[PDB]
Amino acid sequence: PIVQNLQGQMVHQAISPRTLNAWVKVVEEKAFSPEVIPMFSALSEGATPQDLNTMLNTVGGHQAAMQMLKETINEEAAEWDRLHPVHAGPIEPGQMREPRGSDIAGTTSTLQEQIGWMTHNPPIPVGEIYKRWIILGLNKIVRMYSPTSILDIRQGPKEPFRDYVDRFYKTLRAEQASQEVKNWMTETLLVQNANPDCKTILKALGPAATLEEMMTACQGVGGPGHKARVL
Amino acid sequence: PIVQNLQGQMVHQAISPRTLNAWVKVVEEKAFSPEVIPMFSALSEGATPQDLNTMLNTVGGHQAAMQMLKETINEEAAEWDRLHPVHAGPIEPGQMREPRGSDIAGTTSTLQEQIGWMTHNPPIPVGEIYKRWIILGLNKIVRMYSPTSILDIRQGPKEPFRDYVDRFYKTLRAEQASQEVKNWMTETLLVQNANPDCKTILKALGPAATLEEMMTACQGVGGPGHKARVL
Amino acid sequence: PIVQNLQGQMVHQAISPRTLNAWVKVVEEKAFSPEVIPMFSALSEGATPQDLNTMLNTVGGHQAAMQMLKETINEEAAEWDRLHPVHAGPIEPGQMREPRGSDIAGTTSTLQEQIGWMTHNPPIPVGEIYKRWIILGLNKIVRMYSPTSILDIRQGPKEPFRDYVDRFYKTLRAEQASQEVKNWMTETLLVQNANPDCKTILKALGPAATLEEMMTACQGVGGPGHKARVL
Amino acid sequence: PIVQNLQGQMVHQAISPRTLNAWVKVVEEKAFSPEVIPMFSALSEGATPQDLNTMLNTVGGHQAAMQMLKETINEEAAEWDRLHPVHAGPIEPGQMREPRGSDIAGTTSTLQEQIGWMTHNPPIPVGEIYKRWIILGLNKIVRMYSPTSILDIRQGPKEPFRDYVDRFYKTLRAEQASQEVKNWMTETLLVQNANPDCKTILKALGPAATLEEMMTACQGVGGPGHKARVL
Amino acid sequence: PIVQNLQGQMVHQAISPRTLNAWVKVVEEKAFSPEVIPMFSALSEGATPQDLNTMLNTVGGHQAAMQMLKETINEEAAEWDRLHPVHAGPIEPGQMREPRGSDIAGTTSTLQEQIGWMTHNPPIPVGEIYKRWIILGLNKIVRMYSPTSILDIRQGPKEPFRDYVDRFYKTLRAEQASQEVKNWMTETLLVQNANPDCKTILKALGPAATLEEMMTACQGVGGPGHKARVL
Amino acid sequence: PIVQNLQGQMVHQAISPRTLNAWVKVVEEKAFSPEVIPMFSALSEGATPQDLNTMLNTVGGHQAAMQMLKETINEEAAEWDRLHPVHAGPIEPGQMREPRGSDIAGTTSTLQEQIGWMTHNPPIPVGEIYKRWIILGLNKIVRMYSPTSILDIRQGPKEPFRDYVDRFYKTLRAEQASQEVKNWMTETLLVQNANPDCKTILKALGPAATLEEMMTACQGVGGPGHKARVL
Amino acid sequence: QGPKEPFRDYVDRFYKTLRAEQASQEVKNWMTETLLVQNANPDCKTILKALGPAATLEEMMTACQGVGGPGHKARVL
Amino acid sequence: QGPKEPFRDYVDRFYKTLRAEQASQEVKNWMTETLLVQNANPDCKTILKALGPAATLEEMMTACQGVGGPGHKARVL
């Protein structure tokens, strides 16, 4: 990873082996969940395209999804390669050479080149660009390995509004729908898929209710259930 | 977050996945409680708005309570925006755009604007201001994860006064009770239901009395202040 | 806390969550015991009033007793405002204000105002003043919440002099009475409450013999217990 | 390890306790392994061959695997030496002899001589070379010690298609057979050792369809919680 | 403690909680035993007397020992005063002063002055002198907390000589014995008290034999069975 | 330890308990194996004599063995002294002395004077000389309590040539016989006392075969001992 | 303080014995504050406490008179 | 090997078996130090281990006298 000091000073420092493996530990506990994507998205930030590749290789589990991340990454390297075929040198001493989709994946490029691209005029940020490709990969897998879906879920005869809204907000993240569909999912379905007695109570509250009014409501129709609040 | 006084704005390290793993592990396991607040302060010092969004959104649980923390910010960033018009842009190079309330919170701001205010001269402290805005709503959602009520309170069948005061003040700070509120709860509940003999002394002290003189009262007179007898 | 191990210049550095964890544990798991007075003293090193306030505010339990600790500390603030009258504006334009007693207690001052006093030459000693008030307030609490008295404890009809000694020094460290009184306690209270067999030797030793000499004589009382005692 | 910046002087500095501590914990725990290989390459980043031989001898257990390691590197070192003879002079402080194979292997060189090969420009990188012959012996021992071969991999009658491809692509990374054969393993063996209900789905799907279509496919078989995911 | 941060002058650092936690686990788990004294040396690297005295006062019970220890430091502080071996001679007016026993103990000195004398030459390291007083009293506690005496200690008929020689050395370490004693015990009483096969073998070999000769001897005798063994 | 050698800012850095904790854990877990030896030299990189002494005394178990170590250390200090340069001429010549035995082990010499023979010309390294003597005392105890089982391990009917082969190599590395014994054992005992199905083909393969070359062998010999083997 | 003996009789022995005592004045204040109540009687401690620790000498000797009962029974002179 | 014949009978068949053997003298020293001694009696096990191959053979006959001729035993008289 690469650190920027004042006035033109750009230098490189290596990753800690513990801190490197701080995302892998998360998928051990969580699997593929939408909150895993910012967790990676922090660790990948300011990392060099070599480091970015170390991020994927240190995973010894989940080896089909890991191949499938490799597939998403190289399709977008080809798309870029269709954007920018390079046949020709830089023709100005002051100009650093155009990257091919292989360069950006960290396979054809050296540390001086990936650093020099960022210090180039206009600057070329091939790690930010490749990172997005990692996160596309990672978003695909989280969308594929979901345990549930917003149209399936409804509230149990003993579940209080408090818990069911917490899962309905959590569920709403994984769905990739448009804002007005996601808004209607909120406005219609949430109070439509409330249990028989809790719905009676949401109607007696009226149409405009705040989350604090509706969270404290239905606590005598349902009961607490598990402590951990994970399902 | 800053870790060197004059580091550049373009290439910046993110909030550590280690610092994140301490936090996500307390919040998902043990919810919101008052001692999260001083540790959030300890971990979020000099964090950018993208550092703080990362800290809020890398938790997968308790999503209802984070919509309120968000809706709270949404209130306040609008409050800043109804008094502060968008400044006119810079007039020369080396001088930066003034933040709008939506860019203090990370809405319309990207990372190198966020850290570029912070690494500017003088430093402009946009994630402090947003730090104040999170503390506002944290202290709110705390009271939703508060286990028991200071208004619906009684001392047990055979609970000592000494013992109940200890509990009453645990409970009183759990809702973060203001001085008139503490003085009215003292007057209407804590010294209400006492022994008549002890009550002469508790009328003379009243509710603005320090806890040392309050609790240690009536050790020479009267029955017990719990209803069951002690002889 | 204010630190000077990061560069040649003094700088502020944000409180550690491992410091607060560490301070809160001995207070919570054991309540208040004389051990609390070193534990604050090791880890309030370098602290600004604002750290010392966070360190007071962090403990989750014992909420009645911290209230008494807080009242006790703020009594000393008001005292210093009686003693040392000051002004809120400068003594003339281009000066910083002298701290008021409240500013000592961190209520009506900023982080920046506490760096400005502590980085001065010779330093204005606003954490060192407020650290002493808190230690002053510690002494009241560890006496008050001692579950034992020095006057009650004595030697029994089967106990070694070493066991009485061990109990006497632990309790007498905790008690805050006048030095004069504490010296009749080591010269006359220890000597008198001893077992009737031990008084004979403790006179032939007299008051000036060494602590090994006193410990080693009168050890057979009740027999040996060592292998049959807990430690 | 050798550290710091060339212009200011690179400096050699000691091996950290906590890293060495982590390396013996892990070698006991999960030995030589695919996620151990990037942990060794990132730990050994700065490492000299004296450092690589120091950490290799702290391993403890796995001594047949160290013998296998030791004869592959010795043979690599000997292959290098009979390939490339050294005709270097007698040298002085200020001059450096070109290295033999035995100098790569660490076996004829001390640390100072290793310090001065890496601080030449370009480096002679006796470290990166000795590393890659160690990773070459790491993949041989981790193939050898593979839990189950690709050849013997299968899908049982109620065993899921997803649990199966997970182990396929996993045992596929352990194997050190050539890549064209590994084309037939992926294309043929994966359908052919699958259960018959999936073998009908996979032949109809064919090599044209992508990975994501193959991972989406074949999930109504495998039991009730496979069904819920696609419905 | 006193750290170097590579800026050309000595500077203070706050104590770590991990040195405290290492000390209060050590005394708790193991009580007071010969390995806890070189552990305290390890925690005392570059601590001030103030840093050590905090550590001594951090312990709760065992206060008969703590007063014997606090007595022992003050004997050795009072000696270093009258012995004077830091003596300056006669000196002209404006040169740095001669400290005495109270300056080295830090009752009449402060941190920056103790630094003055380590920086001015010939160097005095104040916390070394203090360090060496504490563990002298600790040596006394580990003997007094051990009941076990060299002229008493026995073995049975079935036990190997190796266990009785381990045990004699863990005795002798807590006693810290003289040479006449070690001779008298080795040659006579240890040979005679040793198991009957080991006596017939040991006298023919040399009842005055060295520790390495003695651990060579008595092969095959006492302990488990009589064949299938290398000791 | 000292840190920063071959550089003008050579400095001390404290002993870590992480380091001691490693050494005591392993001496406890399995005592004197050959892997402790590199764990000492890996722990001791940069070590003072104080660091080297400190770490030896931190072990509580095994004191006869540790006392044998000190006997050995003392014998090397005497050996150093016998070959010491003669004391003659000027008592103090006005230059730094030659170090004797006591000095290297650290009993007459302290960190200001030890830096005095690393700065004084030629350089003398107290701790690297002393580390040589401690490894000889470890090596004497490792030799004395030698595992002794190479003759007595053979394979049963269903042994697959893996776990016992490692076990063969572990007692072979334990054994302190010469290279001329060790090279006979690897063409005789290894293969003659192999699993009997395998032993016929290890015979036709070649008895002086390499470890890699033996582990690939024995394919197609049939029987249940072949079924159990994975590769 | 004996079970039937009242404060007055007891605080009168205490001061006769205190005057004979050659102990420092701080301690004689400690002994009046602290030892006096604690070597008073278990059920009498409660009465002094209701009075509060800043009650007068007059008030001290007023306390527990009931527990000592009638003045013809046990004579002061 | 065992204890059933005297050490002199065993060592004599031992050195005949080392006589048949080709393998280098350092390995026949290690058999003489390790395997030879291991199947001896506990009584003289300490002594023979110092004598080993290192000391003169004739010395090895000084000990284990009184053991008895051909047959079962476990220690020496």
HEC assignment per residue over E26-54: HHHHHCCCCCHHHHHHHHCCCCCHHHHHH
Contacts of H38 in chain E (CB under 8 A): 230
Is the alpha carbon torsion for D25, D26, D32, D38 positive or negative? negative
Instruction: Judge contact between D58 and D24, C-beta under 8 A.
Output: yes
Token code pair at residue B163: 């013992």
Instruction: Judge contact between B81 and B100, C-beta under 8 A.
Output: yes
Task: State the residue for tokens 């009485």.
Answer: C164
Cβ-Cβ contacts under 8 Å for B18 (sequence gap 6 or more): A18, A19, A22
Distance between CA atoms of A53 and A166, rounded to whole angstroms?
A: 36
Cβ-Cβ contacts under 8 Å for H24 (sequence gap 6 or more): F180, F184
Chains F and B touch (3+ CB pairs under 8 A): no
Half-sphere exposure of E122 toward its Cβ, with a 13 Å CA cutoff? 6
Distance between CA atoms of A187 and C100, rounded to whole angstroms?
A: 55
Contacts of H30 in chain F (CB under 8 A): 177, 181
Instruction: For A65, list phi and psi in degrees, rounded to 5.
Output: -60, -40
Instruction: For D12, list phi and psi in degrees, rounded to 5.
Output: -90, 135
Instruction: For B183, list phi and psi in degrees, rounded to 5.
Output: -65, -30
Distance between CA atoms of E87 and E101, rounded to whole angstroms?
A: 11
Nearest-CA neighbor of A25 among F100, B155, B25? B25
User: What residue of B is the nearest CA neighbor of A213?
Assistant: B144
What is the three-state SS of G31-60? HHHHHHHHCCCCCHHHHHHHHCCCCCHHHH
C4-13 core/surface letters (b: 16 or more CB in 10 A; e: else): beeeeeeebe
Select the residue of D38, D168, D215 nearest A57 (Cβ to Cβ): D38
Instruction: Judge contact between E94 and E163, C-beta under 8 A.
Output: no
Q: Choose from B2, B5, B6, B11 for mutation: most chain A CBs within 10 A.
A: B11
Contact A60 D166 (CB under 8 A): no
Identity of the amino acid at A60: G
Instruction: For C67, list phi and psi in degrees, rounded to 5.
Output: -55, -45
Long-range contacts from B108-117, C-beta under 8 angstroms, 24+ separation:
B109/B49, B111/B12, B111/B48, B111/B50, B112/B9, B112/B10, B112/B12, B114/B48, B114/B49, B114/B50, B115/B2, B115/B9, B115/B12, B115/B48, B116/B9
Contacts of E144 in chain C (CB under 8 A): 212, 215
C78/chain E closest Cα distance in angstroms: 30
Instruction: Judge contact between D135 and D41, C-beta under 8 A.
Output: yes
Residues of E with CB under 8 A from a CB of H: 197, 201, 204-205, 216-221, 226-227, 230
Burial class (CB in 10 A: 0-12, 13-18, 19+), A124: buried
Contact F177 H30 (CB under 8 A): yes
Distance between CA atoms of A222 and A160, rounded to whole angstroms?
A: 5
D128-140 core/surface letters (b: 16 or more CB in 10 A; e: else): ebbbebbeebbbb
Instruction: Judge contact between A88 and A22, C-beta under 8 A.
Output: no
CB pairs under 8 A between A and D: 58
What is the three-state SS of F30-88? CCCCCCHHHHHHHHCCCCCHHHHHHHHHCCCCCHHHHHHHHHHHHHHHHHHHHCCCCCC
Select the residue of H46, H74, H75 nearest E219 (Cβ to Cβ): H46
The H helix count followed by the E strand count for chain D is 13, 2
Look at chain G and count its residues: 77
Contacts of B215 in chain C (CB under 8 A): 64
CA B39 vs CA C18, C19, C50, C59, E30: distances in Å: 9, 10, 14, 11, 33
Contact G48 B221 (CB under 8 A): no
Q: Torsion over CA of B213, B219, B222 and B226, rounded to 10 degrees?
A: 80
Instruction: For F13, list phi and psi in degrees, rounded to 5.
Output: -145, 140
Q: Choose from H46, H49, H73, H75 for mutation: most chain E CBs within 10 A.
A: H46
Chains A and G touch (3+ CB pairs under 8 A): no
Distance between CA atoms of F10 and F4, rounded to whole angstroms?
A: 5
Distance between CA atoms of C65 and B169, rounded to whole angstroms?
A: 10
Burial class (CB in 10 A: 0-12, 13-18, 19+), C27: buried
Contacts of G30 in chain C (CB under 8 A): 177-178, 181
Token code pair at residue A58: 């240190």
Distance between CA atoms of D130 and D73, rounded to whole angstroms?
A: 8
Contact C60 B33 (CB under 8 A): yes
Instruction: Judge contact between F46 and F1, C-beta under 8 A.
Output: yes
If you ran DSSP here, which 8-state letter would residue E140 be given?
Answer: H
Distance between CA atoms of F18 and D25, rounded to whole angstroms?
A: 13
Beta partners for D3?
D11
Beta partners for A12?
A2
Distance between CA atoms of A45 and E153, rounded to whole angstroms?
A: 67
Contact C211 E15 (CB under 8 A): no
Contact F166 D21 (CB under 8 A): no
CA D166 vs CA A68, A71, A138, D163: distances in Å: 11, 15, 17, 5
If you ran DSSP here, which 8-state letter would residue H60 be given?
Answer: G
Contact F12 E4 (CB under 8 A): yes
Identity of the amino acid at D212: E
The CA-to-CA distance between both ends of chain D, in Å, stands at: 56
Distance between CA atoms of F204 and B40, rounded to whole angstroms?
A: 70
Distance between CA atoms of D229 and D218, rounded to whole angstroms?
A: 12
Instruction: Judge contact between E81 and E93, C-beta under 8 A.
Output: no
Contact F42 D65 (CB under 8 A): no
Distance between CA atoms of A104 and A130, rounded to whole angstroms?
A: 6
Nearest-CA neighbor of F228 among F152, F159, F155, F143? F159
Identity of the amino acid at G7: F
Task: State the residue for tokens 């393993």.
Answer: D185
Greatest pairwise CA separation for chain A in angstroms: 76
Chains that touch F (3 or more CB pairs under 8 A): D, E, H
Please give the full DSSP string across chain F, using - where no structure is assigned: -EE--SSS--EE----HHHHHHHHHHHHHT-S-TTHHHHHHHHTTT--HHHHHHHHHT--S-HHHHHHHHHHHHHHHHHHHHTSPP--SSSS-SSPPPP-HHHHHTSS--HHHHHHHHHSSS---HHHHHHHHHHHHHHHHHHHT----GGG----TT--SSHHHHHHHHHHHH----HHHHHHHTTTHHHHTS-HHHHHHHHHH-TT--HHHHHH---S--SHHHHS---
Distance between CA atoms of A36 and C228, rounded to whole angstroms?
A: 56
Instruction: Judge contact between H37 and H48, C-beta under 8 A.
Output: yes
Identify whether C38 is preceded by a cis peptide bond (ω within 30 of 0).
no
Token code pair at residue D178: 């050539």
Instruction: Judge contact between E15 and C39, C-beta under 8 A.
Output: no
Distance between CA atoms of C129 and C103, rounded to whole angstroms?
A: 11
Measure the CA angle with vertex D176, ends D175 and D178; round to 5°: 110
